[model samples]
Target: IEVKPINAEDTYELRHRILRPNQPIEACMFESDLLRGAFHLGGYYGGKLISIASFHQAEHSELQGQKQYQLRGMATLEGYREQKAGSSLIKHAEEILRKRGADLLWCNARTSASGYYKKLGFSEQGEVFDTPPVGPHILMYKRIT
Candidate 1:
């Protein structure tokens, strides 16, 4: 599998297909997707984009940092999870963030996937919080060491 940078529009389809099914296509688009320092990534296998993740520079007042990146809208095709595209996406993005001198990377991770992030060395920042139409999520972060 190979991971590469993709345009914001490239992420919409899967974000709708997997992450927000039954929601309008517009629901898959994030406002910050077009902002500076934001980027979208896609994982390709057999020449098809199978997984996607998005990131953008943002500050969390609850966290102490100047340079930070928030991961959002990460989704992988059910068929591709066995190929490890999800983790590959994070590692690839983290490397890019590393080169950018980013100090921390975080996400409002779905509670069900929190353990997955934990195994990847991310620590929970605080108690779980509820998000409408999604469910419970937690703030998780990792120092880009």
Candidate 2:
């Protein structure tokens, strides 16, 4: 798998590969813009882009201004789920963050994926809940070593 900061001109491929087919293109564009200001990492396999995991430095005031990053858009192609591709992608992102000196990493993991994140040593933070758009989710965090 290959992971790197996305080249702006090549971002189209990354957006297309990571978003749902029926998702609005405008949404991807907006998200791409958001990622540009943050750390964006993707995992590619067999010459095809498979997963894109986005992240941004945390800005919560309650954390005493400590440095942290939040993982976003942690997705794998629909059919690529059980192939260890997503796991590898997430692992690489973690390594990149640690190497960058991030204090911690956090995510609002999909409810179905809470266990997966937990296996990576992330603990649930807020109460388990559903996202505004109607999907189950839980806030989880992992301290970077």
Candidate 3:
């Protein structure tokens, strides 16, 4: 079970597998490889990749200076679902953000997963809205401070 930073070409496949399981995530669209600005993290067990998540600082026309981050692309293999793999990844992200002056962390969590986010200290910010393929996502937010 090893975790580390990936920035070179060797990680393209791993990044693709994490972001676009059925497709591919463009290299240019993201900040960089994992652990750079996008704060992507992966977990391995028995030397095989098993879990992944990304913590991204929000930036867009509608939201500014919020000092918030979005949790995205959280996935774990089917058998690993109830094992706290996702929680572990998010906890790592929280520690990083806490150290770096982040004020909040938020996610458009699928309604079904809202309970998980709630247990992690994020509160529902708004009503649920339909998201492509995944259906209704409830916006949840946590104030780090």
Candidate 4:
């Protein structure tokens, strides 16, 4: 899989399909998705964009980093799971963030997927919480630089 920076627009459809199915494409966008420090990453396999993750500068009292980036809109197409595309997107993002001097990374991860994040070295930061239509999620964070 080839993981690289991609435009926010390139992530919307996959976000809508895997993470927010039945929702409008516009609903896939987070308010910070197009902000100055925000970035999108895509994992391309078989010449198809199969995974996506968006990142933006954000802060959390639970984290002490001077610069924190929140990982949002992360999802891999169902058919592409177990192919390393999702993990590759994250490793790629981490390398970029390290170079940019980012100190931390965090995300509200679906409980079912929390173990996967933990395997990626992120620590769970809080009690599980529900975000409606999305069900239960936990805040997961990691020190990157």
Candidate 5:
């Protein structure tokens, strides 16, 4: 598998297919997706984009540092799950964030995917919270060391 920096639109299809299949593609459009310091990454296998992730620079008042990135719209196509493509994309994102001087990276992680995030060294920071249509989620974060 290969991971590469991709355009914002490159993530929409996969995000819709994997993260919001029943919702409109617009649901995958994040407000900050095209803002400065925002980035999108894709994992390709067999010449197809199998996983996608987006990150945007933001500040979390509760986090220690001022520089922060919020990870959003991360998803791996059904057939690509457990193939390491998603992990590759995440590592790529981390490298970019570190190079850009980000202090930390965080996500409102779905309860179902919390284990995966934990395996990647992210720690849970708060109690479980409901995100409606998406069910329960928790704030997970990792230092950009």
Candidate 6:
């Protein structure tokens, strides 16, 4: 598998397919997705993009830094789940943020993915909360720099 920085537009399909099926492609677009410090990463296997994630600046009280990045819209095509594509993208994201002088990373992870984030070294920061149409989510955070 190969993972690298990709344009924001490149994340739409996988984000729509895996994270917001039945919803319009715009449903998967985040406001910060096109901002200067924002970035997208894609993981490909056999030349097909199978996993995608986005990172951008966000302020989180628990993360404790002026420079923090939020992980948003992470999704792996069903066929690529458990193949380390998500993990690789996450590690690569962290590396990129660290080099940029970011001090922390955080995500509002769906409850179902909390375990996976934990395995990647993030810790739950607050109470689980509901996100309509998607269900419960918890804030997960890690210090990268």
* Minimal lDDT window, size 10, model 5: 57-66
Report every candidate's CA lDDT.
0.90, 0.69, 0.67, 0.88, 0.88, 0.89
Task: State the TM-score for model 2.
Answer: 0.76
Measured by lDDT, the strongest candidate is 1
TM-score of each candidate structure, all chains considered together: 0.96, 0.76, 0.74, 0.95, 0.95, 0.95
lDDT of 5 by residue, 1-145 (tens): 8888899988888888778888788988888897777888888989899888899988877777778999999898888889988788889888889999998999999999999999999999979999867799999999986
- Please provide the root mean square deviation of candidate 4 (C-alpha atoms, Å): 1.0
What residue pairs clash in candidate 1, if any at all? none
The TM-score obtained by model 6 is: 0.95
**Segments in model 6 whose C-alpha atoms lie over 4 Å from true places:** none
Whole-model alpha-carbon lDDT for candidate 5 = 0.88
RMSD of each: 1.0, 3.1, 3.9, 1.0, 1.0, 1.1
lDDT of 6 by residue, 87-130 (tens): 99999998899899998999999999999999999999879999
Cα lDDT tens digits for candidate 2, 1-145? 6766664334445555554345555545544345434756666778876767767776544332277888766777776667776677678877887888877888878888888888788888767777654378888888876
Q: Model 1 TM-score? A: 0.96
Candidate 3 clashes between residue pairs 3 or more apart in a chain or in different chains: none
| Ten contiguous residues with the weakest lDDT in model 3 | 27-36
Candidate 2 segments whose C-alpha is farther than 4 A from its true place? 7-23, 30-37, 61-65
The alpha-carbon lDDT assigned to residue 72 of candidate 6 equals 93
lDDT of 3 by residue, 1-145 (tens): 3454333343346546544455445642444234446767776666766676667677433333357788776666655567676777788888888888888887778788889888888888656799664478887888887
- Model 3 TM-score, all chains together: 0.74
